[PDB]
Ligand binder design. Sequence first.
Ligand SMILES: [Mg+2]
Ligand SMILES: [Mg+2]
Ligand SMILES: [Zn+2]
Ligand SMILES: [Zn+2]
Ligand SMILES: [Zn+2]
Ligand SMILES: [Zn+2]
Lengths: 162, 162
Amino acid sequence: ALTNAQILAVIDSWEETVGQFPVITHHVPLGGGLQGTLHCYEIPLAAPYGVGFAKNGPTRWQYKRTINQVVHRWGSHTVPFLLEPDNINGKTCTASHLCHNTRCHNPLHLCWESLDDNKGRNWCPGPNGGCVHAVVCLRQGPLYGPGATVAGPQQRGSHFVV
Amino acid sequence: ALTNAQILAVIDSWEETVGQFPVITHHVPLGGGLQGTLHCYEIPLAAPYGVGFAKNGPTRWQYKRTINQVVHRWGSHTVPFLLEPDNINGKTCTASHLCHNTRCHNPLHLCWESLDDNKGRNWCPGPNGGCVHAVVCLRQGPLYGPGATVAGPQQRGSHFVV
DNA sequence: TTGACTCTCTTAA
DNA sequence: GAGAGTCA
DNA sequence: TTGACTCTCTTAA
DNA sequence: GAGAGTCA
Ligand SMILES: [Mg+2]
Ligand SMILES: [Mg+2]
Ligand SMILES: [Zn+2]
Ligand SMILES: [Zn+2]
Ligand SMILES: [Zn+2]
Ligand SMILES: [Zn+2]
C-alpha cells in the first residue's frame, strides 16, 4: 500500500503539474444579478496534457504515477482527495466541479461529495442568490432558471384532483 | 395512433383507468417551512395494474392499446402529452413528476419537459421556498438542502487562486 | 516508467 | 427518464 | 386482443 | 461522474 507520505508526494506532483496548466479567466453569474470571476486551470484539449496525464474519454482524464515498480492510476480530479474518506452515508464520493468546467483541475474549484450533491449544484441559485450548500457554491449553477417546460399539469375530464 | 381523434381516445381511456387507481394522500414540504398535501393516483405494486398497463421495469410501466388492428404502446406517464411537441431546443421531452412519486399517474402531477428540467426539480426549494420554475413545482425537491460534502476545495501549496 | 490511445462502467432522473 | 420482444 | 413478463437504451453528472 | 487494457 502507498504510505501517507507517498500519497502526499502524488498530490504535490499533481499540483505542480496542474499549476502549469493554462489559467483561464471566466466571468460567471454568482446569483442575485451579480457577476464574479473564476480562474480555471484548464487541461489542454489534445495531447500532450502534462506529465502523468492521459485522456480516457471526451471529458475524462486520469493521472498515473509509478511507485516502486507499481503503476497507480486515479481519476484526474480525484487526486486532491486521496487522503479523504471515499464514501459517505453509503454513497461513493465523487470529484465535483464548483466551476462546472470539466477541463479545469484547479483544486480550489473542486469538492468531494456524493453524485447527487454534485449534480444538484447544476441548478443552485449561487452564493449570492440563495445557495444553501454547506460547502458553498462558487457560482450560480449553469442550469438555474425558470426552465423550458413544454406542457404543464392538465386533464381532459374531471377524474382527478391535485 | 395517427388521428387526433384516436389520440384523444387514448388519452381519455388512460384517464378513466388511472382515475380508478387508489388515491394516496402525501404530505409534502413546500419550502419556507410550510407543508402541503398532494393526492397521488398510484398504480398497483403488482399485476393486474389496470386495463392497458404493464410493468417493464421496477418503476417503469407502459400503456398499450390496439388501434387499426395494430398495437400502439407508450411510456405510462407520456400519454397525457401525446399531442405535444416531443422535443424542445433539440432535447427530448420527458414526463416529469412534480410529486416525485413514480407510481403516481395523476396528470395533475405531471409535466412535459427536458430531462435536465426534470432532474433539476429534485433540488428545487419549492413553491413556498423560492421555486422559479415557470411551470411551478408542487413541492420542495426531495434532495434540497445543505448536502453532505466530505471535503471542500483545498490546496497543499501555493500554485492556485480561486 | 511513460504517453497516448483503447474499452466499458455508475447513478438516478 | 425511455423503446421493444416473448410468450400465453 | 389483452395481460404479464423479458431485455436493453438515454442522458449528463 | 468512474475503472482498467494495450503497446512501444
Ligand atoms: Mg458536477
Ligand atoms: Mg423527475
Ligand atoms: Zn475551474
Ligand atoms: Zn449551492
Ligand atoms: Zn403524484
Ligand atoms: Zn421548482
